[PDB]
């Protein structure tokens, strides 16, 4: 009410030379209107004065008006409809850059009334003789569809597939594919042959669009599906990674001696995606993580490509590490453990903790290398690093559960590492190893007494494992540890206020006071010994190799 004048000011001074007669400094004016409203200045009062500059013959000045109009076409569409009479005069002008830019500007306006204006002037643009205009009109059908005469436009998209300029063919296929999400049949004789010949000549973004459409096609005969694949095979040599991953998605679908030759031609293009820029390697390695599950015989020999390089980002280091495990076999476990030992000495504390856990995943997967993984972790603990030692205790615990009564010489070396333990899960791993095997540990009660003095202010995982261990120590060594169990069950049932802790204290208190012989088969019995997408979801995500369903490893229903 105070700083709105319309007699003087910046809006007044802008409105002045926009009304002037020189063309070249009305062009400077509209640039000042775009640069005002980009930063966030309110130039809504200049709207009927900018569209007076539409009636001209200059191409540069007419685009600057259209750029001003496009910024209104999405946020406040009810204002940009007020100049729609100037659009429909421009969409039959010569200099067909004006005709295409008129049709784009009309299509981007979300107003129900504009469908009366994307009538009959649109169908001339679908039949235009400049292919740059047919390219524009092909997309604007999908703009109009996203808002029965347009059902007559749908067959005009099919007519544009038979064109000599292939970029017109490209956007028409991309238009039909988005329309077919909410409704195209690609029957062989003329559709597939004209798509694959346009595939060899169109631009790099249209080859994505054609190879995304062929994945919807269902072939019938086995050598008919083979006859497609000799044309798709040279498309996995392209510079773009989006073209290669779309070519793979067709070839992973149309996979019914040429079978053996095709799987040998999938491995060099998937290797060469990893020389790319780090966002692309993430998109590739999330798909490589799916391909080595469904077809593990493609990249069986290529584990050296997947070794983590130091300057990779953290989202490429963690995805390269999941594929090194899936290719970890007995023929190459020795160089994997050369790498996993090396990554565990890096300064990235987030990545070292996963490299040490990847060692125990190689011991569980490759059973023949269990001793080499145990000797690898022992060399890590001798470094005395705080975040490696207490990580490797967790991993050794899962080996003792997996391979019991084999590796228990090393506990005399693990038990001297107690003062380097401050994680709750890492302390609970040593208490389990002291709780088990206590007829092998010399001073198991002197170790477990050192934890009961600080029984509170420990985690309930540590409190429960220390409860389970001292009961196991009692049934293994009665009459030495009578003081510990009367200590810890007084700590559990009387001092602690956790209900889950104090009744587990009771269940042990009831069993020891009923029959310690009966408690031996209950507590100290032998425990039964103890990571891949299930093939319903897995075979779904191979049908979406390029897309975000494979980057997320989730079906498209959750998007």
């Amino acid at each position: 009410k105070y700083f709105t004048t319309n007699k003087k000011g910046e809006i007044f001074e802008l409105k002045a030379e926009l009304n002037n007669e020189k063309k070249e400094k009305r062009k400077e004016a509209v640039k000042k209107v775009i640069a005002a409203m980009t930063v966030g200045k309110d130039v809504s009062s200049l709207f009927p004065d900018v569209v007076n500059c539409m009636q001209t013959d200059n191409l540069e000045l007419k685009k600057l008006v259209y750029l001003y109009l496009m910024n209104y076409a999405k946020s406040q569409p009810d204002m940009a409809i007020m100049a729609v009479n100037s659009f429909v005069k421009d969409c039959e002008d010569p200099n067909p850059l004006i005709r295409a830019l008129a049709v784009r500007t009309m299509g981007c306006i979300r107003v129900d009334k504009i469908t009366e204006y994307l009538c009959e002037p649109l169908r001339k643009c679908l039949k235009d003789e400049d292919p740059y205009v047919r390219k524009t009109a092909a997309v604007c059908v999908a703009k109009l569809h996203d808002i029965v005469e347009d059902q007559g436009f749908l067959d005009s998209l099919r007519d544009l597939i038979a064109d000599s300029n292939p970029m017109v063919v490209a956007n028409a296929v991309a238009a039909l594919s988005e329309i077919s999400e909410s409704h195209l049949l690609d029957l062989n004789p003329q559709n597939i042959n004209k798509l694959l010949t346009a595939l060899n000549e169109c631009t790099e973004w249209g080859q994505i669009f054609i190879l995304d459409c062929l994945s919807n096609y269902n072939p019938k005969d086995d050598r008919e599906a083979q006859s497609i694949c000799e044309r798709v095979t040279p498309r996995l040599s392209h510079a773009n990674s989006a073209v290669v991953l779309s070519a793979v998605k067709v070839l992973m679908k149309f996979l019914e001696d040429y079978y053996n030759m095709l799987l040998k031609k999938l491995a060099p293009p998937l290797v060469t995606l990893l020389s790319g820029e780090p966002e692309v390697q993430y998109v590739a390695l999330r798909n490589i993580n799916l391909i080595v599950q469904k077809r593990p015989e493609i990249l069986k020999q290529e584990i050296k490509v997947f070794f983590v390089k130091y300057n990779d980002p953290i989202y490429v280091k963690l995805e390269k590490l999941d594929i090194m495990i899936r290719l970890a076999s007995q023929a190459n476990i020795a160089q994997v453990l050369a790498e996993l030992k090396e990554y565990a000495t890096e300064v990235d504390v987030d990545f070292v903790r996963k490299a040490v856990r990847a060692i125990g995943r190689c011991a569980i997967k490759v059973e023949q290398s269990a001793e080499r993984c145990v000797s690898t972790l022992l060399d890590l603990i001798q470094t005395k690093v705080n975040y490696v030692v207490q990580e490797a205790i967790v991993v050794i615990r899962d080996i003792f559960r997996k391979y019991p009564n084999k590796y228990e010489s090393i506990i005399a070396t693990l038990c001297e590492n107690l003062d380097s333990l401050d994680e709750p899960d890492a302390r609970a791993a040593m208490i389990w190893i002291v709780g088990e095997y206590a007829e092998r540990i010399d001073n198991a009660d002197e170790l477990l007494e050192s934890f009961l003095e600080g029984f509170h202010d420990e985690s309930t995982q540590v409190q429960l494992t220390l409860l389970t261990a001292i009961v196991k120590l009692f049934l293994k060594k009665p009459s030495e540890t009578q003081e510990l169990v009367q200590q810890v069950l007084s700590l559990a049932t009387q001092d602690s206020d956790n209900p889950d802790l104090r009744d587990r204290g009771y269940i042990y208190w009831r069993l020891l006071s009923t029959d310690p012989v009966t408690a031996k088969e209950v507590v100290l019995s032998e425990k039964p010994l103890i990571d891949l997408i299930e093939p319903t979801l897995l075979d779904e995500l191979i049908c979406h190799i390029g897309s975000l369903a494979s980057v997320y490893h989730k079906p498209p229903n959750a998007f």
């Binding site: 009410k1 105070y2 700083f3 709105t4 004048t5 007699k7 003087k8 000011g9 910046e10 007044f12 001074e13 930063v39 966030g40 200045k41 309110d42």
Partner: protein, 141 residues
């Protein structure tokens, strides 16, 4: 007490900044950019009272500009909202339906108005009649 007075548009660039507190030149730039990080976010139904780093900021927008006064936490925030509006009305008759560009071209006259009305972190003169009596007398001197 008042600690500064800001005038800045939605573009972010200031039209007046008078400081009543001893800050460094880069600290003055640091506060300015994080005032309109507060003021531009708030809508027309939020309150005009934002706590700001240990004191409070008081604003009102005049359709292209923000007048921000930054006072202590104890201060009467409903009286400093009207001393803002009292300061605009003095600028309204002194510049004859003031625009934004009167603050750009005549910044040295704006410091005369602020000294006339807000001196040493307090409100000096509230009367619109006596300020316009004083400012036009200095205009012809």
């Amino acid at each position: 007490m008042i600690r500064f007075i800001l005038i800045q548009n939605r573009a972010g660039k200031t039209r007046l900044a008078k400081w009543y507190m001893q800050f460094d030149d880069d600290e003055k730039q640091k506060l300015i950019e994080e005032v309109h990080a507060v003021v531009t976010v708030r809508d027309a139904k939020h309150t005009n009272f934002v706590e700001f780093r240990n004191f409070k900021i008081i604003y009102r927008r005049y359709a292209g500009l923000y007048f921000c006064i930054c006072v202590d936490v104890n201060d009467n925030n409903l009286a400093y909202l009207e001393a803002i509006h009292n300061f605009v009305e003095v600028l309204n008759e002194y510049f004859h339906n003031v625009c934004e560009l009167d603050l750009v071209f005549n910044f040295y006259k704006v410091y005369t108005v602020v000294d006339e009305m807000f001196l040493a972190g307090e409100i000096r003169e509230t009367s619109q009649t006596k300020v316009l009596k004083q400012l036009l007398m200095l205009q012809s001197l």
